[PDB]
Structure 1
Amino acid sequence: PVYPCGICTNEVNDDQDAILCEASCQKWFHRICTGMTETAYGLLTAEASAVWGCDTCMAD
C-alpha cells in the first residue's frame, strides 16, 4: 500500500530486492517482477552513476 510495486502492486519491503525508476515514474519495482537477474541488480546497486527506468517509462 505504501510502496506498491509498479508491476505486481504488492508491498515493496526493506528486505526485498527492489529498484526505483529514477527515469520518470519514481515507483519501486521488485527485481523479480521486472525480470532482472541478481547479477544485474548487484551491479546497478554498485554504479552510483547508473539510472534505471521501468519498461513503461522507457517506452515513452
Structure 2
Amino acid sequence: GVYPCGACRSEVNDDQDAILCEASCQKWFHRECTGMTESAYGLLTTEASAVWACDLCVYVFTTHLANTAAEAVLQGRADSILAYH
C-alpha cells in the first residue's frame, strides 16, 4: 500500500478493512486500529451521506457513534445509522 494508517503508522493495504477520515484529515485507518465493529464498518460503507472522523480529529460519525448506531440498526431500533448522527 502507499498510505500508512493514521493510528499505527503501518501500511494500509486494499485487502484490509480500512476507513478514510473524510471529516477532516483524509488519512486512512485500519478498522481494527480504531475499535470500529464489523457492522459499523459495513453500514458506514454504504451510507453516502455519512463521513467518519478519526480519534485524532453530510452527517459526521465518530467510531463510538457509528458503533452505537450500527448496534441499534441491527436490532431494529433505528431505521439507519443516520438517526445517530
Alignment size in residue pairs: 58
Shift of 1:25: 0.7
Following TM superposition, the consecutive aligned residue runs of length 4 or more in structure 1 with deviations greater than 3 angstroms are none
| TM-score, with structure 1 as normaliser | 0.90
C-alpha distance in 1, partners of 2:23/2:50?
Answer: 10
| TM-score, with structure 2 as normaliser | 0.65
**One-letter amino acid matched to 2:47:** E
Higher-Rg structure is 2
Counterpart for residue 5 of structure 2: 5
**One-letter amino acid matched to 2:26:** Q
| SS of corresponding position for 1:41 | helix
Unaligned runs of 5+ in 1: none
**One-letter amino acid matched to 1:35:** G
**1:12-55 C-alpha deviation (Å, 9 max, x unpaired):** 00100000000111000000000100000000001011010101
**One-letter amino acid matched to 2:50:** A
* CA RMSD after TM alignment: 1.4
Q: Mapping of 1:1-60 within 5 angstroms?
A: 2-57=2-57
Unaligned runs of 5+ in 2: 63-85
